[PDB]
């Protein structure tokens, strides 16, 4: 027994992020392919923050550059952005970035999700918070382990992107239990739903207010998915919103 929730791949997630930007201009709609992975999400975030610093200094971008965005529009986004939505594509089997990309490619050809999984890392620059959302709670590793990893990373970000008041990046592991209970392919949608809740209200623990019943929980997510798919219908194709 499973509520019907569409699988959201890199293309639909990106469309949703573009839509979210128009609602919350501080959100930069980072491209979802090639995706962040557990092997390079930290370095990816650092590169983006370094490029924001460069833009704020009126210096050239170092990259990497967006595929669906002009150079100038990307600079406009970096100037403005307060929040990085980093989507990490994960699979238990591959042991390197190269093998992860190969597995993703194979699964895409098959039109299958398999054991693959989307994680969300929110880098809130304005509030200086790192938020890790795993709809499966501990799929990659126990949350206490990810917390330690991200505490180390937070210290690094304090050096890469310092605050004048020397405020330190904080870390939050958002899910306190398995969220995606009884569902096999809803992780992309869950990440976007969590992201939307966070954009509306970064304090309220929306996850705690979910129905205990697995089906009702995912039928609510399906309602959210339906609302999003309608909203992104007419968004320009493979093209960032104009900042």
Numbering used by the authors: 159 to 401
Question: What did the article's authors report about this structure?
Answer:
The chlamydial effector proteins ChlaDUB1 (CTL0247) and ChlaDUB2 (CTL0246), in the following termed Cdu1 and Cdu2, were demonstrated to have in vitro deubiquitinating and deneddylating activity. Sequence alignments clearly allocate Cdu1 into the family C48 of the CE clan of cysteine proteases. C. trachomatis Cdu1 is a 401 amino acid protein with a single-pass transmembrane domain located towards the N-terminus and a predicted flexible area up to residue 167. We further show that Cdu1 specifically deubiquitinates the major apoptosis regulator Mcl-1 at the surface of the inclusion.
The Cdu1 (155-401) fragment crystallized in space group P21 with two molecules in the asymmetric unit and at a resolution of 1.7 Å. The catalytic cysteine, Cys345, is located at the N-terminus of α-helix F, which is ‘sandwiched’ in between a set of three anti-parallel β-strands (1,2,3) and two extra α-helices, A and G, which are perpendicular to each other. A search for other related structures utilizing the program DALI indicated that Cdu1 (155-401) shares a high degree of structural similarity with Ulp1 despite the fact that they only share 17% sequence identity within a stretch of 221 amino acids. Remarkably, however, a small loop between β-strands 1 and 2 (shown in yellow) in Ulp1 contrasts with the much bigger α-helix D in Cdu1 in between the equivalent β-strands of both structures. We speculate that this helix could act like a ‘lid’ that plays a role in substrate binding and/or recognition and assumes a different orientation when the substrate is bound.
